[PDB]
Amino acid sequence: LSDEDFKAVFGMTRSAFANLPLWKQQHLKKEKGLF
């Protein structure tokens, strides 16, 4: 996705998301139907 779309879908920037636990990044992406 674009950085703008990512922020819209996940409610934070990529940089922010990358600070979450790896399993949680995986979970949040799968919950939204993304990889």
Resolution (A): 1.1
> What are the sequence ranges of the domains in the chain?
1-35
Query: In degrees to the nearest 10, what's the CA dihedral of 18, 15, 12, 30?
Result: -30
How far apart, in whole angstroms, are the C-alpha atoms of residue 9 and residue 20?
A: 16
Q: Dihedral of CA 16/10/7/34: which sign?
A: positive
Per the entry, the structure determination technique was X-ray
14 within 8 A of 6, measured Cβ to Cβ: yes
Class of domain 1-35: mainly alpha
18 within 8 A of 25, measured Cβ to Cβ: yes
Question: Within a 13 Å sphere around the CA of 27, how many CA atoms are in the beta-carbon half?
Answer: 5
How far apart, in whole angstroms, are the C-alpha atoms of residue 21 and residue 1?
A: 21
Phi, psi angles (nearest 5°) of residue 11: 75, 20
